[PDB]
Write a protein that binds this ligand. Structure first.
Ligand SMILES: COc1ccc(C2=N[C@@H](c3ccc(Cl)cc3)[C@@H](c3ccc(Cl)cc3)N2C(=O)N2CCNC(=O)C2)c(OC(C)C)c1
Length: 88
């Protein structure tokens, strides 16, 4: 009974670019796939892998910054919620 969400078009484009095949998700799925996006596109610092650089990327459009640490949970959840609607 986790909340279901419907990503808006930019977030959905990112999710589908890493092989998600649906239009509704749980938050934990959304997080999982954004993490995979970062990993597969190598947007992280090789030395401190918590650090992301996304200025040249649609991910930077979603989060509204050129760089962030994955420890920025307020920012990450807030920007994700701005990019979806709740279904069920
Ligand atoms: C020391 O290296 C780590 C430690 C933790 C994370 C991480 N941490 C997880 C996480 C981060 C923030 C929130 Cl709010 C929730 C979950 C999740 C995640 C989810 C969404 C985004 Cl936008 C980024 C990362 N997330 C991951 O996606 N991980 C888990 C670890 N390894 C991975 O290959 C993927 C991490 O993320 C990379 C993608 C940068 C790197």
């Amino acid at each position: 009974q986790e909340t279901l969400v419907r990503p808006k078009p930019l977030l959905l484009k990112l999710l589908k670019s890493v092989g998600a095949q649906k239009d509704t998700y749980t938050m934990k799925e959304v997080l999982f796939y954004l993490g995979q996006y970062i990993m597969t596109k190598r947007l992280y610092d090789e030395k401190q892998q918590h650090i992301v650089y996304c200025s040249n990327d649609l991910l930077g459009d979603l989060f509204g910054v050129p760089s962030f640490s994955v420890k920025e949970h307020r920012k990450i959840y807030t920007m994700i919620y701005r990019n979806l609607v709740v279904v069920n």
